[PDB]
Design a binder for this molecule. Structure first.
Ligand SMILES: CC(=O)N[C@@H]1[C@@H](O[C@H](C)C(=O)O)[C@H](O[C@@H]2O[C@H](CO)[C@@H](O)[C@H](O)[C@H]2NC(C)=O)[C@@H](CO)O[C@@H]1O
Length: 618
């Protein structure tokens, strides 16, 4: 009430005293993922502050830094790094931001990973998203990280989407909106600034904006009804920030520019559109929080617009923060920042960007820093004290317990005929573990090893088969014939098996098609030899359509395995626990699964999921 009124006035008074260089500095958020010091031969992961990076923070007075996995490998190192970044910031504390989404996008080396957004979708309950946001937020807070670029509220209603997929809650706008809203609230309750992404909605692309500039051709009515819906709900409920999409939406803005690549005309990406960022987001939708660009180093921008140019265009469009405006990995490259600043200055001096617009943007940034307790600094503990506290919080047993429950709830049973599941092996049974990569067979193996040690199943022998880039051969059939039980993980991004007249082609010997051909070959051999067989879908669940013949089929919505003594995601263990009757899946599909054998039909509908014991829909 009065705090918000005081905050706006304080932000105004503070910005009125800043020089233009200081104001423009606040609007930049670089990364320093890697760094090459004086005397070093090439850039390496920046895990510890040095005086070279600190001097650039002091010189350019950035508003924030985005951190990547390279920068946050251990809790102890992270707390030291964020303290050191704040010590380097000469006047205003930094936003220190990160992509700790959960599931398949996480960064913290020792943090709790969580099963991810589509898993939260499968589990349905919005309180689970709140708990996820809250725990991630608590971990980030302990680490001195104050901004999370989460939640993704893109709606994955194009199954071929290669960049969103299980990063989305759902193909349904209400489920996505509800879980996005509660993620955001959980983060904010821990005083973490939360950014909705990617506006105005990246869900219906089949092109990755990392590698090319995607186009969404839907009309305004559809965009308002679907894409914009979860953004509006979270904006109305007090979203702090919104990250843009480098994606073309001609229904909102058909302005074109001459590409710097091929000289051709290209539709403006939303990030650089005044109609989208000011007309729609700011004015129509009433968002007055911080608008941050998607990363400006991505091909969707960098291919077609110059480096300085993209930053200037983004600010002209109405964004408040330019994310990763230039890549500087040594002091020899530091003028890149000076050139971005000078380009912004010229735009202000010529009136192309009124100085008042700069003031308003910096006031938003400062206001957010005050609102979330970044400014002034709240914590008077020593770094040693902060480290000790964070080591008890980040990846804590309580957090691991919560992660396990959520991952297990999310497991979605799609088929279980004649009680194929749970597997109940006799002593000495041979279990064949089949998955694309060694980390995935290792995750399944370790989980089973733990079950044996904890006397949950009888002792069994385990063999592994890693099938990425392989073609199913006699040696593989022999292993199938020798097994008593077979667990196979399937991994797809875009599910594109070759099918003719309703028949999936199993005659394909091109090893590059391994993802859609090899698991089917294992199934076929297992069924032919009357072997208990379960297929676990590991990434996008659409591959469930590749296994209509199977008697047992589950989806876990997360594919990362086990490496260096650590589970990189909880999803595979949760699925293995379900397979052996040691967890209760409660998942229902948060997307439709299109039929592969009958194109244009839905094989499994949104909301479908079985009770593993009874076979009745949940
Ligand atoms: C490991 C790593 O550094 N990845 C990043 C990208 O992050 C995404 C989330 C990933 O791991 O797949 C990053 O992608 C974009 O950039 C923003 C900042 O990281 C993200 O917040 C944003 O969500 C993401 N945009 C989309 C559409 O996913 C990318 C940008 O250069 O750099 C690495 O690939």
């Amino acid at each position: 009430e009065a705090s918000a009124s005081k905050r706006a006035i304080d932000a105004n008074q503070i910005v009125n005293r800043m020089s233009l260089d200081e104001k423009l500095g606040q609007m930049l958020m670089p990364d320093f993922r890697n760094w090459q010091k004086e005397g070093e031969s090439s850039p390496q992961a920046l895990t510890k502050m040095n005086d070279e990076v600190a001097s650039l923070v002091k010189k350019y007075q950035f508003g924030g830094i985005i951190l990547f996995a390279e920068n946050v490998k251990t809790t102890k190192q992270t707390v030291q790094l964020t303290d050191d970044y704040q010590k380097a910031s000469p006047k205003i504390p930094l936003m220190l931001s990160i992509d700790q989404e959960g599931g398949i996008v996480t960064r913290l080396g020792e943090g709790t990973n969580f099963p991810g957004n589509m898993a939260l979708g499968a589990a349905r309950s919005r309180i689970n998203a709140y708990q996820t946001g809250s725990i991630i937020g608590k971990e980030l807070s302990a680490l001195g990280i104050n901004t999370d670029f989460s939640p993704v509220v893109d709606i994955n209603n194009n199954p071929d989407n290669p960049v969103i997929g299980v990063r989305s809650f759902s193909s349904n706008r209400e489920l996505t909106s509800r879980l996005g809203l509660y993620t955001m609230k959980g983060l904010q309750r821990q005083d973490i600034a939360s950014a909705l992404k990617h506006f105005p909605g990246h869900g219906d692309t089949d092109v990755d904006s990392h590698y090319g500039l995607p186009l969404v051709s839907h009309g305004q009515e559809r965009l308002r009804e679907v894409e914009l819906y979860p953004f509006q709900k979270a904006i109305d409920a007090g979203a702090d920030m919104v990250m843009t999409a480098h994606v073309q939406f001609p229904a909102f803005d058909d302005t074109t520019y001459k590409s710097k690549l091929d000289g051709s005309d290209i539709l403006v990406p939303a990030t650089l559109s005044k109609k989208v960022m000011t007309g729609l987001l700011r004015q129509e939708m009433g968002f007055n929080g911080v608008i941050v660009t998607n990363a400006l180093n991505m091909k969707a921008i960098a291919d077609h617009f110059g480096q300085e140019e993209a930053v200037v265009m983004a600010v002209k469009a109405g964004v408040d923060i330019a994310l990763m405006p230039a890549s500087v990995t040594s002091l020899k490259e530091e003028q890149k920042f000076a050139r971005v600043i000078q380009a912004l200055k010229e735009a202000v001096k010529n009136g192309d960007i009124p100085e008042q617009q700069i003031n308003n943007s910096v006031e938003r940034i400062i206001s957010l820093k005050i609102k979330r307790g970044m400014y002034p600094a709240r914590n008077s503990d020593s770094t040693k004290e902060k480290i000790a506290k964070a080591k008890k919080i980040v990846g804590s047993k309580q957090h691991l317990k919560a992660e396990k429950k959520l991952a297990e709830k999310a497991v979605t049973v799609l088929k279980n005929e004649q009680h194929t599941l749970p597997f109940k092996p006799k002593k000495g049974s041979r279990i064949l573990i089949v998955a694309p990569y060694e980390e995935q067979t290792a995750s399944i193996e370790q989980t089973i090893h733990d079950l044996i040690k904890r006397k949950k199943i009888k002792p069994v022998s385990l063999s592994k088969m890693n099938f990425a880039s392989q073609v199913f051969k006699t040696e593989h059939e022999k292993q199938v014939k020798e097994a008593d039980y077979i667990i196979t993980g399937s991994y797809v991004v875009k599910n594109d098996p070759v099918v003719n007249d309703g028949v999936i082609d199993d005659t394909i010997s091109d090893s590059s098609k391994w993802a859609t051909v090899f698991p089917r070959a294992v199934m076929k051999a297992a069924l032919q030899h009357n072997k208990p067989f379960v297929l676990m879908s590991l990434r996008n669940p659409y591959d469930a359509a590749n296994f209509e013949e199977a008697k047992a089929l589950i989806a876990v919505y997360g594919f990362k395995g086990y490496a260096n003594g650590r589970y990189l995601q909880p999803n595979i263990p949760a699925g293995v626990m379900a397979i052996f009757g040691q967890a209760k899946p409660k998942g229902t599909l948060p997307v439709d699964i299109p039929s592969v054998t009958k194109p244009g039909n839905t094989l499994y509908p949104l909301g479908y999921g079985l009770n593993i014991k009874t076979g009745r829909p949940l």
